[PDB]
Ligand binder design. Structure first.
Ligand code: VZ1
Ligand code: ZN
Length: 257
């Protein structure tokens, strides 16, 4: 089964998921001098006021906070998107050191981590149908750099002790994902894929220009999680990021000048 080690990491994924070598794989490097400002792009609409978080979980690949997506409660709209996309979950990718961990890069710069808020297009009815469509998902990507603490992240960080190993989950209601956003919603956008198996090419990526800052104590808490399940040799959950993939016949558009 897949992971991020020498023998099961991103260089192996194509054997079970041959779309790993596809025409619209993610993440990619964002060359800021080649992305074109697109004035036709609208502002993004992030409507998270009615978000209903449910649980926090260690899935062996990362940790995730899940939301009730049975109604339009927390939706992403506008920007490059047609229609309404409901927030399903968010999770992160992070490094063993502050100089690596993000999946997207910006002029080859790697950030310490990257947040993915995962949304699906309601015209397809359920997430499973949406993953089979080229416009099925929209993932909002936010870079993390190490500096000042992010107060809106601290409730996440303080429960990680309780889901140390894969398969563990905990109640995590009443969490406000608005506390994870930077000030600016300036973004880059391009068509891409899931960055973990099945690597489906179903994602409109929206990557925010402005990173959020998190403290060294907060990211250290990410790094104490485990890939393994309880009672198995401890392998720290670090460097759970896929590297940049070929851009091929794609063009990255910027919402700003
Ligand atoms: C059944 C149920 C219910 C609720 C509420 C949440 C969940 N959690 C969930 O579905 N997680 C993944 C959905 S996926 O699209 O199939 N996988 C995927 C997503 C994003 C990326 S990424 N790294 O490109 O952002 C990579 C892979 C499940
Ligand atoms: Zn992700």
């Amino acid at each position: 089964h897949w992971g991020y080690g020498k023998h099961n990491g991103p260089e192996h994924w194509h054997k079970d998921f041959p779309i790993a070598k596809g025409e619209r794989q993610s993440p990619v490097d964002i060359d800021t001098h080649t992305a074109k400002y697109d004035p036709s792009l609208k502002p993004l609409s992030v409507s998270y006021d009615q978000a209903t978080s449910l649980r926090i979980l260690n899935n062996g690949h990362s940790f995730q906070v899940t939301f009730d997506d049975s109604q339009d409660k927390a939706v992403l709209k506008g920007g490059p998107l047609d229609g309404t996309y409901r927030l399903l979950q968010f999770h992160f990718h992070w490094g063993s050191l502050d100089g690596q961990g993000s999946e997207h890069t910006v002029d080859k710069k790697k950030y310490a981590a990257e947040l993915h808020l995962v949304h699906w297009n309601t015209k397809y009815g359920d997430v499973g149908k949406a993953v089979q469509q080229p416009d099925g998902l929209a993932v909002l990507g936010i870079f993390l750099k190490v500096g000042s603490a992010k107060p809106g992240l601290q409730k996440v960080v303080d429960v990680l002790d309780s889901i140390k190993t894969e398969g563990k989950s905990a109640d995590f209601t009443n969490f406000d994902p608005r506390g994870l956003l930077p000030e600016s919603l300036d973004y880059w956008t391009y068509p891409g894929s899931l960055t973990t198996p099945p690597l489906a090419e179903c994602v409109t990526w929206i990557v925010l220009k402005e990173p959020i800052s998190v403290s060294s104590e907060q990211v250290l808490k990410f790094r104490k999680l485990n890939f393994n399940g309880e009672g198995e040799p401890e392998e720290l959950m670090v460097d759970n990021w896929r590297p940049a993939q070929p851009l091929k016949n794609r063009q990255i558009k910027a919402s700003f000048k």
